[PDB]
Amino acid sequence: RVLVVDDDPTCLMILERMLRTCLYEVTKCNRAEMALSLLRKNKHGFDIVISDVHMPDMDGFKLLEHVGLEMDLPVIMMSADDSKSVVLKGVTHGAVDYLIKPVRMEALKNIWQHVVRKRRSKKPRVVWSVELHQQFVAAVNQLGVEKAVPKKILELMNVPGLTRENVASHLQKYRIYLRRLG
Amino acid sequence: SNAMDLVQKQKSLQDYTKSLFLEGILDSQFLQLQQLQDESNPDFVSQVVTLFFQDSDRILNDLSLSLDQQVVDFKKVDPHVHQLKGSSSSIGAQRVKNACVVFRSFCEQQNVEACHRCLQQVKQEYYLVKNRLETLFKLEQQIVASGGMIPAV
């Protein structure tokens, strides 16, 4: 069910145990290019990726871009840095939620939400470029996350060729992360 | 052989574990680790703690080399300190976690003199928690070696 990408072996060994008590199948990984090729394989069937921001072979935010945006997958950001700046960088790079080290056991129950929201959909992906996503999060946070509704989020981005149900399902995907901001 | 001796060992182990929390050496994250250890995962706390020791022994050796360089490379100093913060914060070694936070304050300022004092405090806090956790595990093995048993809910 869950691929976990973390170069910290202790945090990896703990988080695998915690996810297993929540009854997830767990696969470990410690290189971002390794996790990418693992996800690339056909029929791999991974439901959620949890990935650290700190990654030795890739910018771990660019890893969030590859798993969150280029692939239509829920990636959950993970970091022992707490700052508001790091949390905002998760949304703005395609992550769907975040976990702060040390990982709360309670925080792990809230991630089951993101796979079930994923399972509401072999059928075609819709891929967002990183910049188009970054102005989507620009529009909703300028609009107010409560106030931001598919009509005005598209009316503020002003992207020719962007429809409202692109925005409607993108609001569906990132609602939870953007509400947690502010 | 005394049954009474195993009784003392149980109390001493009990009181010792209590003292690690009350003295601030371990925080509630360590109690979370003990709560992930059950009949099916009976050595989990020992195994996590031993891995934390191997990784952190490497990180401190690497920081001691990095800070001893003639031109300190904070691109190589900083991510070690960051891993050790999450490393120690995830097993509950609270004084180590906090000492790494102050260390990160001085890589961010690139203050090498402060970084040397920070590495000395982090080493001192790690060797403290390493002594305590190893004492904890030795006390348990002594109980088993007496023919005893730790109930482990």
Residue numbers in the entry:
A (entry chain D): 38 to 158, 236 to 296
B (entry chain C): -2 to 150
Could you pull the original sentences from the published paper?
The MSP signaling involves four consecutive phosphorylation events at: (i) the kinase domain of the sensory histidine kinase, (ii) the receiver domain of the latter protein, (iii) the histidine-containing phosphotransfer protein, and (iv) the response regulator. The second element in the MSP system, AHP, receives a signal (phosphate) from the receiver (REC) domain of HK and translocates into the nucleus to phosphorylate the REC domain of the RR. ARR1, a type-B ARR, contains the GARP domain for DNA binding, in addition to the canonical receiver domain that mediates AHP1 interaction. To bring new insights at the molecular level, we investigated the structural and biophysical characteristics of the AHP1/ARR1 complex.
The asymmetric unit (ASU) includes two complexes, each consisting of one AHP1 molecule and one ARR1-RG. While the electron density map clearly defines the entire AHP1 proteins, the region spanning 77 residues (from 159 to 235) in ARR1-RG is not visible, indicating the flexibility of the fragment that links the REC domain and the GARP motif. ARR1-RG contains the REC domain (residues 38-158) and the GARP motif (residues 236-296). Notably, the α3 helix is slightly bent compared with that in the published GARP structure of ARR10 (Hosoda et al., 2002). Despite being separated by 77 residues (159-235) in the ARR1 sequence, the REC domain and GARP motif interact with one another through a vast interface of 1044 Å2 [calculated by PDBePISA], as shown in Figure 2B . The Tyr291 residue from the GARP motif reaches deep into a hydrophobic pocket of the REC domain (inset). In other words, because part of the GARP interface that binds DNA is also involved in the GARP-REC interdomain interaction, GARP must be set free for it to bind DNA. AHP1 is composed of six helices with various lengths (from 3 to 10 turns), in which helices α3-α6 form a four-helix bundle. The phosphorylatable His79 (Ruszkowski et al., 2013) in helix α4 is exposed towards the ARR1 recognition site, which is highly conserved among type-B ARRs. In the case of ARR1, it is composed of the catalytic Asp89 at the C-terminus of the β3 strand, the double Asp motif (43-44) in the loop between β1 and α1, Ser116 at the C-terminus of β4, and Lys138 in the loop between β5 and α5. ARR1-RG binds AHP1 with a 1:1 stoichiometry through a relatively small interface of 875 Å2.
